[PDB]
Design a protein around this ligand. Structure first.
Ligand SMILES: [Cl-]
Ligand SMILES: [Cl-]
Lengths: 233, 233
């Protein structure tokens, strides 16, 4: 059975990957994002949806989890979804500006504003992807994300959170916060994932050197054949 | 660190103030209310709000917390907010009838009915003030407040609760009840305030004789200079 990283182990693994193994950020972010998109398409496949193409709102935060979201959105389009992105706070680095351009050019719209009522989110978007905050946030929830998360917690449509449910604490979680229906753990699950109560928990980020896995006793399962996602239980 | 009163200590402090120190109710309620309005303006200052003047719905209960709410509302108006009040159950005592007249004459509207859906509350009112029940309720939530609280718990806009979040138990709290974004503890925090998870917790009711403070080991911080509120952490 698979380990659940503490916030410190997770930073170690991350630091290793970028420093020992010398993976660049682009690379892991591409694979992370592809893995999110893939998990979303396995859990909420387009044929199972009422609209066609199915609609998805991807809300990207101000760091890496956001970057993951942009990558996720772009692959979602190619999997036959109709994504829309809301990216209120964008770092001015070409990683992020490249991601925005890539999505613009694939006719993926960036909204000027978050629809202000849950019901409106629900009628426009069959699925919302929470790419707001990742593991390394501590935090604390400054606007406009407080207000965003407050809308999210009133939705009726499912939420899919990347790595961690934004607003939860990475180890202890949050009973009063958002309650995703899908969680996509990247690399390995974090401790907060124990408090997870949605239907689907997938593991993604299949780029773990088997040495690293062993060094931190991750007990990652065997991803089947050519798959970049595994559904945990 | 500041103490958190039990429900019995709080009744003692209160009884003292009105009996030993011989503060009248008018007096402390004026200061309490001013303090609430002030904390609201520090946490949600008008310039930070999308509407101008910013709108606020103040829901007043059937006792003192309600009284606090009416005072709060009247000072909010003078701070440049556009308050509206909902006061379904009004004691026929001139304290309360004076408060109502004061607000009426400042063109503060009292609604005939609570807007029945959260979404409607959200579109009309940028902030809602919960002045329904204070510490000395036990309770139990009779209509129309059950239904009111049920709407409040679906809002997207922030709630500011005066002294205690109505519907919580004063010492143990309530996971299934409303979740204010601002709590204004009066005099000193009550035990329920430990379960508080909103962004802002202010301390108000700066009228504590330093003797009383000492007698109950309150450890009230030093309110800065001329301030009637201190933000706790
Ligand atoms: Cl902020
Ligand atoms: Cl009743």
């Amino acid at each position: 059975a698979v380990k659940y990283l503490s916030q410190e182990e997770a930073q170690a693994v991350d630091q290793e990957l970028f420093n020992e193994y010398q993976f660049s950020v682009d690379q892991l972010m591409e694979l992370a994002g592809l893995s999110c998109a893939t998990a979303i398409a396995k859990a909420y496949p387009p044929t199972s949806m009422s609209k066609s193409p199915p609609t998805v709102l991807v809300i990207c935060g101000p760091g890496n989890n956001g970057g993951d979201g942009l990558v996720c959105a772009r692959h979602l389009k190619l999997f036959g979804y109709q994504p829309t992105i809301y990216y209120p706070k964008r770092p001015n680095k070409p990683l992020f500006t490249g991601l925005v351009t890539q999505c613009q050019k694939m006719d993926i719209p960036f909204l000027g504003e978050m629809p202000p009522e849950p019901m409106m989110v629900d009628e426009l978007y069959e699925l919302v992807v929470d790419a707001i905050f990742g593991f390394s946030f501590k935090g604390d929830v400054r606007e406009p994300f407080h207000s965003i998360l407050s809308v999210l917690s009133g939705l009726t449509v499912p939420i899919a959170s990347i790595d961690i449910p934004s607003g939860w604490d990475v180890e202890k979680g949050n009973p009063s916060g958002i309650q995703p229906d899908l969680l996509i753990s990247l690399t390995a699950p974090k401790k907060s994932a124990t408090h997870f109560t949605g239907r689907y928990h997938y593991l993604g980020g299949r780029f773990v050197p088997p040495a690293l896995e062993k060094k931190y006793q991750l007990n990652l399962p065997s991803y089947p054949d050519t798959e970049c996602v595994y559904r945990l239980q």
